[PDB]
A paper describes a structure:
The protein kinase recruits STIL/Ana2/SAS-5 and Sas-6 to a single site on the side of the mother centriole where they assemble with CPAP/Sas-4 into a cartwheel structure that helps to establish the ninefold symmetry of the centriole. Here we show that Ana2/STIL proteins also homo-oligomerise and that mutations that perturb the homo-oligomerisation of fly Ana2 in vitro also strongly perturb centriole assembly in vivo. Thus, Sas-6 homo-oligomerisation alone appears unable to drive efficient cartwheel assembly in vivo if Ana2 is unable to homo-oligomerise.
A SEC-MALS analysis revealed that the purified protein, either with or without the Lipoyl tags, formed a tetramer at a wide range of concentrations (36–900 μM). The purified Ana2 CCCD protein readily formed protein crystals that diffracted extremely well, enabling us to refine a structure to 0.80 Å resolution. This structure appears to be unusual as we could find only one other natural soluble protein in the PDB that homo-tetramerises through a parallel four-helical bundle (NSP4, a tetrameric enterotoxin secreted by rotaviruses). These polar side-chains form an inward facing hydrogen-bond network. We replaced all ten residues at the d and g positions of the CCCD with either Ala (CCCD-A), Ser (CCCD-S) or Asp (CCCD-D) (residues circled in red). A SEC-MALS analysis revealed that all of these mutant CCCD proteins behaved as monomers rather than tetramers in vitro. Thus, in flies, the Ana2 CCCD parallel tetramer tethers the CR2 and STAN domains in a particular geometry and stoichiometry.
Author numbering:
A (entry chain A), B (entry chain A), C (entry chain A), D (entry chain A): 195 to 229, 991 to 999
Write the structure that this text describes.
Amino acid sequence: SDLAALVSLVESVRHEQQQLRNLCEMILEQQQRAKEFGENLYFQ
Amino acid sequence: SDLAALVSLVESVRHEQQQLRNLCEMILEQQQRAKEFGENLYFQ
Amino acid sequence: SDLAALVSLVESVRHEQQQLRNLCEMILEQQQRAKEFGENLYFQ
Amino acid sequence: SDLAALVSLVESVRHEQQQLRNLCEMILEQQQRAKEFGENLYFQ
Ligand code: NA
């Protein structure tokens, strides 16, 4: 009951952490595209 | 009592995680503006 | 005893999350400097 | 039993947080390389 409510709360933390992970994967991908763009302008 | 204190601690973790999420959203937005700036200099 | 060990574990999660927060603040600051550098080359 | 299952869940959260930390270290490193590239084009 109190244990169950705490388990649910930790599951919410876990879910919100995955949303943050997915955001950070988007950050990595977008910065890589920007980096490759700059490199394409210099090397080609 | 011990359960209540642990619940409060997990709520603090959850709050701090949202502060981190909001920071990472700012990172994404700022890098997108920088990326679009570079693209504006090349495509226009 | 089991409760105490779980509290310690959650405190470790909280600490590691702050280390991650401090890293993400460094990411924001460094990207801002890079963005401002590019802008300095164009606007001045 | 319920305590054990909760401990396992928190350990999963901790592991997933380290995966996120490692991703964010890669973000920092890649952006630093991009920043240094731009600086190399201007200062040399
Ligand atoms: Na977290």
